């Protein structure tokens, strides 16, 4: 209601493109509150095709739901601007998306980070589940890095507004059936994405042939750094019987346990030389760019 601000083209400007796709283009932007002389960095996602007035109201309705997600591991939609292209505005996450982060910091990301990112991502998903929301498009590309210690799931509602075949539960490929437990399936691909430092899933497989290899019992290979304990949890996220997959509350518990003995569950060369931020460095991050409570 008062969670979504309707903006006007006149009061903000796009500065530089950040990322592309098809559905929308992402820009870094500047918000200029009227009557003021300050320029506030924002993230702007402008969507592909123009919409009629009645489509706009279906979008605006959904925007409100997006604007109500209040959890330190899910991005909240802050605002919206509607013309022929519609623009989504939210806080600017300067570190970008977590897929790219792990690829660029491939080998030199410690085990505490990886397992802690698994906790945060599950905590955010479990929040959506508690509110009976279903994401439909969890993947490493859809997790944003606020600070290296603080990641947020993004793009809730965008997939539900308008195909990521290699992240989808089997039931969703064959029957377009989306649930909380189908979200658990993609969560497991996402973890797999992190543990391989952003390898592409089913590399060497047509997207058209994924449902058959899944029916024949094929799953994504164990990552070299993952112990069997972690790989079994991923493998449990990909079971055919959706209801046998773990629930997010359990994944938070399980990964949290592992985050407490990180070098027992992930084997990374040089892990001992990669430590987690001190109390000092982490107060500094929070005071500067990450003041929200957790």
Ligand X SMILES: OCCCc1nc(-c2ccc(F)cc2)c(-c2ccnc3[nH]c(-c4ccccc4)cc23)[nH]1
- Give catalytic status of residue 281 as yes or no: no
Of positions 13, 105, 235, 236, contacts a copy of itself by CB under 8 A: 105
Secondary structure (3-state) at 13: strand
User: Half-sphere exposure of residue 126, counting CA atoms within 13 Å on the CB side?
Assistant: 15
Judged by CB under 5 A, which stretch of 17-25, 124-132, 241-249, 262-270 contacts Cl ion? 17-25
Binding mask 261-290 for a copy of itself (x = CB under 8 A): -----------------xxxx-xx--xxxx
Q: Is residue 21 a contact point for ligand X (CB under 6 A)?
A: yes
What residues contact residue 245 under an 8 Å CB cut-off, 6+ apart?
A: 181, 184, 185, 236, 237, 238, 239
Q: Is residue 19 a contact point for ligand X (CB under 6 A)?
A: yes
Of positions 59, 69, 82, 93, contacts ligand X by CB under 6 A: 93
Residue 281: which of ligand X, a copy of itself, Cl ion, none does it interact with, CB under 5 to 8 A by kind? a copy of itself
What residues contact residue 157 under an 8 Å CB cut-off, 6+ apart?
A: 62, 63, 65, 66, 77
Report the distance separating Cα 26 and Cα 20, nearest Å: 6
Binding mask 22-61 for Cl ion (x = CB under 5 A): xx--------------------------------------
Report the distance separating Cα 62 and Cα 71, nearest Å: 18
Residues in touch with a copy of itself (CB under 8 A): 2-5, 31, 35-40, 42, 76, 78-79, 91, 94-95, 104-105, 108, 148, 278-281, 283-284, 287-293
The catalytic site residues sit at: 137
Residues in touch with Cl ion (CB under 5 A): 21-23
């Amino acid at each position: 209601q008062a969670l979504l601000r309707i903006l006007k083209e006149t009061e903000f400007k796009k500065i530089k493109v950040l990322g592309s796709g098809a559905f929308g283009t992402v820009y870094k932007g500047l918000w200029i509150p009227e009557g003021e002389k300050v320029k506030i960095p924002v993230a702007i996602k402008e969507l592909r095709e123009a919409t009629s007035p009645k489509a706009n109201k279906e979008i605006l309705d959904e925007a409100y739901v997006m604007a109500s997600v209040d959890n330190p591991h899910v991005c909240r939609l802050l605002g919206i601007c509607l013309t022929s292209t519609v623009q989504l505005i939210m806080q600017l996450m300067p570190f970008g998306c977590l897929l790219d982060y792990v690829r660029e910091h491939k080998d030199n990301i410690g085990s505490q980070y990886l397992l802690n990112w698994c906790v945060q991502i599950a905590k955010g998903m479990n929040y959506l589940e508690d509110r009976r929301l279903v994401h439909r498009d969890l993947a490493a590309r859809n997790v944003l890095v606020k600070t290296p210690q603080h990641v947020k799931i993004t793009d809730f509602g965008l997939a539900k507004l308008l195909v990521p075949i290699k992240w989808m539960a089997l039931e969703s490929i064959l029957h377009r059936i989306y649930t909380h437990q189908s979200d658990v399936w993609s969560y497991g691909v996402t973890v797999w994405e992190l543990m391989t430092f952003g390898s592409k899933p089913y590399d060497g497989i047509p997207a058209s042939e994924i449902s058959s290899i899944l029916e024949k019992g094929e799953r994504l290979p164990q990552p070299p750094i993952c112990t069997i304990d972690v790989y079994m949890i991923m493998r449990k996220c990909w079971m055919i019987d959706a209801d046998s997959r773990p629930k997010f509350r359990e994944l938070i518990i399980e990964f949290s346990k592992m985050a407490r003995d990180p070098q027992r569950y992930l084997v990374i060369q040089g892990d001992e030389r990669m430590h987690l931020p001190s109390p000092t460095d982490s107060n500094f991050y929070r005071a500067l760019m990450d003041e929200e409570d957790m």
